[PDB]
Amino acid sequence: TVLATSRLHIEGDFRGYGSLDKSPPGALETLNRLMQNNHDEFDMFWRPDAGHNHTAHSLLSVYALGGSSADLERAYRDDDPHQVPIGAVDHSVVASLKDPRIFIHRMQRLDQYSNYLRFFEERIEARGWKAVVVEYLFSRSDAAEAMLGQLFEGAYHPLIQLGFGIEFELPGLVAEGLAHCAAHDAANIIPFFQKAEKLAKSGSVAPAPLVELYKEVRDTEKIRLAAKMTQGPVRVRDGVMGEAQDDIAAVAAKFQVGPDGLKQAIIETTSCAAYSCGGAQRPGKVAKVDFFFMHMVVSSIFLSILARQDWLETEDKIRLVEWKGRLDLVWYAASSAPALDRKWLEQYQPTLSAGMDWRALYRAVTVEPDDGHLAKIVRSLKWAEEEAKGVETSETIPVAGSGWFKLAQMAYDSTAHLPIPAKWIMGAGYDFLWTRVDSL
Amino acid sequence: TVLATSRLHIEGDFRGYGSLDKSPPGALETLNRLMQNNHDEFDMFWRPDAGHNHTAHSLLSVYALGGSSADLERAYRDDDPHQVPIGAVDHSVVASLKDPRIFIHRMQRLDQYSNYLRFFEERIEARGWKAVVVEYLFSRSDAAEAMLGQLFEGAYHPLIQLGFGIEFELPGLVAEGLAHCAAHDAANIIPFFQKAEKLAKSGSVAPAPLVELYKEVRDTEKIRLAAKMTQGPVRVRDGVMGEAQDDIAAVAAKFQVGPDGLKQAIIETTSCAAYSCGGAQRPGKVAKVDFFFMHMVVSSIFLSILARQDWLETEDKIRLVEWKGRLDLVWYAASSAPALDRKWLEQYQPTLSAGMDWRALYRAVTVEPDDGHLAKIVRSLKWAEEEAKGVETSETIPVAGSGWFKLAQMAYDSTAHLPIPAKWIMGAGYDFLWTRVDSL
Numbered sequence: 001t002v003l004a005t006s007r008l009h010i011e012g013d014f015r016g017y018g019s020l021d022k023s024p025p026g027a028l029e030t031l032n033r034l035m036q037n038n039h040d041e042f043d044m045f046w047r048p049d050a051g052h053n054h055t056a057h058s059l060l061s062v063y064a065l066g067g068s069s070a071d072l073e074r075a076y077r078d079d080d081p082h083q084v085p086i087g088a089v090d091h092s093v094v095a096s097l098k099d100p101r102i103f104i105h106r107m108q109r110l111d112q113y114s115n116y117l118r119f120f121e122e123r124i125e126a127r128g129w130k131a132v133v134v135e136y137l138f139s140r141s142d143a144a145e146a147m148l149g150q151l152f153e154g155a156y157h158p159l160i161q162l163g164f165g166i167e168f169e170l171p172g173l174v175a176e177g178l179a180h181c182a183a184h185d186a187a188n189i190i191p192f193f194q195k196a197e198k199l200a201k202s203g204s205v206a207p208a209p210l211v212e213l214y215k216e217v218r219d220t221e222k223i224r225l226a227a228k229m230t231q232g233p234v235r236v237r238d239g240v241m242g243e244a245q246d247d248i249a250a251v252a253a254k255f256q257v258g259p260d261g262l263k264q265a266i267i268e269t270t271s272c273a274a275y276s277c278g279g280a281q282r283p284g285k286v287a288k289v290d291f292f293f294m295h296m297v298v299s300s301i302f303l304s305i306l307a308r309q310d311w312l313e314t315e316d317k318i319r320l321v322e323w324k325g326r327l328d329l330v331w332y333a334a335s336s337a338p339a340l341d342r343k344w345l346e347q348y349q350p351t352l353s354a355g356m357d358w359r360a361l362y363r364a365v366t367v368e369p370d371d372g373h374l375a376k377i378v379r380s381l382k383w384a385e386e387e388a389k390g391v392e393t394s395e396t397i398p399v400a401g402s403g404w405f406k407l408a409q410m411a412y413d414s415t416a417h418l419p420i421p422a423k424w425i426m427g428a429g430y431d432f433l434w435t436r437v438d439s440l
Numbered sequence: 441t442v443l444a445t446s447r448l449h450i451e452g453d454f455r456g457y458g459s460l461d462k463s464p465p466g467a468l469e470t471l472n473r474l475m476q477n478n479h480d481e482f483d484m485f486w487r488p489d490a491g492h493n494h495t496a497h498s499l500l501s502v503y504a505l506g507g508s509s510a511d512l513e514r515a516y517r518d519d520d521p522h523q524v525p526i527g528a529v530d531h532s533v534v535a536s537l538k539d540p541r542i543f544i545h546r547m548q549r550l551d552q553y554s555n556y557l558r559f560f561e562e563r564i565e566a567r568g569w570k571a572v573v574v575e576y577l578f579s580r581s582d583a584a585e586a587m588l589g590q591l592f593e594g595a596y597h598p599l600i601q602l603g604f605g606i607e608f609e610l611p612g613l614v615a616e617g618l619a620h621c622a623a624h625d626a627a628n629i630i631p632f633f634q635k636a637e638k639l640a641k642s643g644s645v646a647p648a649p650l651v652e653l654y655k656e657v658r659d660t661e662k663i664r665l666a667a668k669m670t671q672g673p674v675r676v677r678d679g680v681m682g683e684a685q686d687d688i689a690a691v692a693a694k695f696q697v698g699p700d701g702l703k704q705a706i707i708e709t710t711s712c713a714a715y716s717c718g719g720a721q722r723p724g725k726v727a728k729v730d731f732f733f734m735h736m737v738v739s740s741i742f743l744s745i746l747a748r749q750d751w752l753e754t755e756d757k758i759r760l761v762e763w764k765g766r767l768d769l770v771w772y773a774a775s776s777a778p779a780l781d782r783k784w785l786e787q788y789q790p791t792l793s794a795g796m797d798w799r800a801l802y803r804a805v806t807v808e809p810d811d812g813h814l815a816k817i818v819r820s821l822k823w824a825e826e827e828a829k830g831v832e833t834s835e836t837i838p839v840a841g842s843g844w845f846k847l848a849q850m851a852y853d854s855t856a857h858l859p860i861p862a863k864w865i866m867g868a869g870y871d872f873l874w875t876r877v878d879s880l
């Protein structure tokens with residue numbers, strides 16, 4: 001039986017957070033065709049590590065930046081490597097997932113994506129997508145607490161997938177996000193979240209600004225050196241969580257958001273993530289942006305979007321921002337906690353993007369061969385500028401004002417005209433990775 | 441203390457199995473300097489999966505094919521991505537490794553490579569490389585039995601590393617190989633070897649020709665479909681061993697070598713591996729060689745070399761070839777057990793390599809940008825021609841005579857002038873991987 005949920009159709013003139021120029025005629029038709037092909041044909045996971053399908057992200061971000069049909073076609077073709085046949089659905093597995101104990105038991109296995117997708121499309125057909133999201137992420141059941149930890153997995157890819165689904169109110173894409181969240185392999189971050197939150201709610205831990213928690217991670221040798229360069233995509237699971245889970249959980253417990261603090265906590269987390277990207281440069285080297293710090297920035301727009309959902313309690317919004325800010329510390333550790341300095345972004349001189357404004361940089365991004373991360377980071381940075389409107393740099397807000405566009409320029413300048421593997425440095429704290437980077 | 445073992449000096453006439461032209465003057469001095477630099481500066485593992493450092497393989501193979509200094513420098517620069525800083529040695533761990541229970545206990549952890557290297561260099565300094573290899577692979581201690589399974593790990597890279605060391609009688613390279621063997625992460629192949637051998641020695645399993653065991657793997661649906669395309673580097677651990685270990689153990693138990701069978705078993709295993717490579721083609725597609733089948737052929741020369749060692753008993757030689765032939769069945773399964781047909785290699789018309797002899801193919805391979813697999817597969821095929829001199833195709837020997845060189849031509853034609861990722865098909869049985877291969 002075909003479900004109306006399985007049909008992804010964007011209609012009306014909503015073109016995304018941080019949108020500037022409207023896409024020219026033809027773009028929406030192209031977007032709907034490609035989003036549906038990707039939905040129907042392709043799995044969420046194309047390899048065991050760092051194998052998230054970015055197709056939907058690249059399409060929606062290029063549309064939000066005002067890309068034409070041909071720019072969307074480029075985005076789709078550039079993500080050919082992310083596109084592999086979707087796994088066969090086992091319909092008796094899908095029936096059995098109604099049982100919360102079987103639902104939980106089958107989580108954290110990549111090969112279950114297509115079974116969770118059918119399950120969530122059926123549930124969303126029966127209830128709204130809103131009711132299903134509350135049931136499976138925010139209802140405090142054993143299932144939903146596991147799902148909430150899973151949401152941040154793999155440097156925030158489930159969060160990003162559900163984010164887009166919620167942003168465009170696309171039921172089928174919300175199903176993609178929930179199924180991604182359920183199936184994502186575990187980095188042993190759930191006990192990090194549980195231990196950090198317990199300490200945070202105990203009354204034994206005084207809050208501290210996030211900027212100081214980045215510093216504690218760097219200054220704490222056991223934590224800074226927990227990850228190893230050659231652990232690659234499993235640095236969090238085998239390093240930070242393997243060796244220092246309790247230690248970094250105690251640091252993370254110090255990130256505590258007051259009941260009126262949701263907006264400021266989004267700016268604080270986003271500003272620190274942006275500081276990460278801009279601030280981890282080396283003397284005598286061209287600017288490069290850390291691949292992981294870039295995921296910390298791209299995911300920030302989805303905290304802003306979830307924050308404006310009327311069906312979601314303020315306390316759940318705050319909880320999302322707390323957990324994201326705490327895992328930002330883990331990703332900072334996994335890059336070997338590089339020294340950050342406000343000087344690099346302040347002093348940065350744009351090259352390829354010299355003299356561009358947002359509209360010209362958006363345009364330049366729509367035509368740039370890329371897997372979608374460029375469009376995603378520049379859109380997050382435009383949105384951050386609006387979120388943090390009238391907030392200036394302070395001891396606790398390291399990036400603000402003209403900083404947001406400067407980082408977008410740096411991300412464009414340091415990735416344009418390069419093959420994918422050369423675009424982003426894979427852990428700015430590891431000295432050896434800077435020997436493969438150009439000297440000024 | 442500096443060990444004499446730590447210094448790699450290749451001196452004098454010996455230039456490798458299947459060698460033809462002598463390298464011109466200057467090459468030996470370049471080879472010694474680069475082999476030493478790689479030995480002292482770089483780890484064995486540069487990422488957690490498919491992360492083996494091929495630098496020593498690419499150098500020694502290019503030398504054996506008669507490459508000059510410039511060709512060896514090319515080989516070294518092409519393997520730049522394989523070259524990351526060698527791990528800090530813990531000297532108290534090194535002293536503890538003399539205890540066989542601590543030895544066993546720290547096995548199968550990649551980050552121990554440098555610790556096992558220093559241990560094996562100290563032991564080889566004291567006793568000689570030959571005594572240390574017998575002790576740690578062939579003495580049937582607990583440690584040696586675990587090391588013998590590890591030898592075949594990651595599609596034969598420890599076997600290859602040790603093989604080169606034994607071939608050039610290079611103490612320090614023997615130590616690299618034994619340390620690689622100890623540290624390699626486990627794919628759950630040890631229980632496969634144990635189960636297959638217990639069945640073979642039981643008296644209850646009749647021997648069958650290897651080519652009929654490839655057929656049985658293909659024709660047993662539970663074995664053929666155990667591996668999944670998107671399991672990628674972990675198809676063996678999570679697919680063939682995860683789902684079908686007992687099943688494929690029972691097939692592999694039928695490969696049994698009699699006490700006078702060593703030479704014919706090397707020829708049989710090498711011929712079935714070559715047949716894998718040349719025979720897994722598709723109608724209407726350009727020829728491509730499977731990456732894993734290529735590893736099955738390149739490893740085959742090191743069985744021939746181990747077979748000629750005076751210090752190793754015939755029993756042990758026979759046991760190596762048995763285990764290798766049995767695990768070739770597992771790698772065949774992991775590529776989805778593609779249909780094989782002798783017609784493809786029989787009918788193949790060389791393109792780039794048309795009209796070349798071995799000397800000209802060797803010369804062309806010395807200059808081809810590559811990570812070392814091209815030089816390794818063409819040398820194993822030349823050596824296979826020598827090993828199998830006077831053996832013709834039969835019901836059990838599916839490739840012989842002119843087929844060895846014809847496969848070397850196909851490997852050259854199908855990989856030359858392509859970037860590394862386009863060179864070898866990563867599982868010839870998976871229909872989807874052929875949609876990215878050029879049509880005729």
Ligand SMILES: [Fe+3]
Nearest residue numbers: 052054295373
């Ligand atoms: Fe990503």
Ligand SMILES: [Fe+3]
Nearest residue numbers: 492494735813
């Ligand atoms: Fe290899």
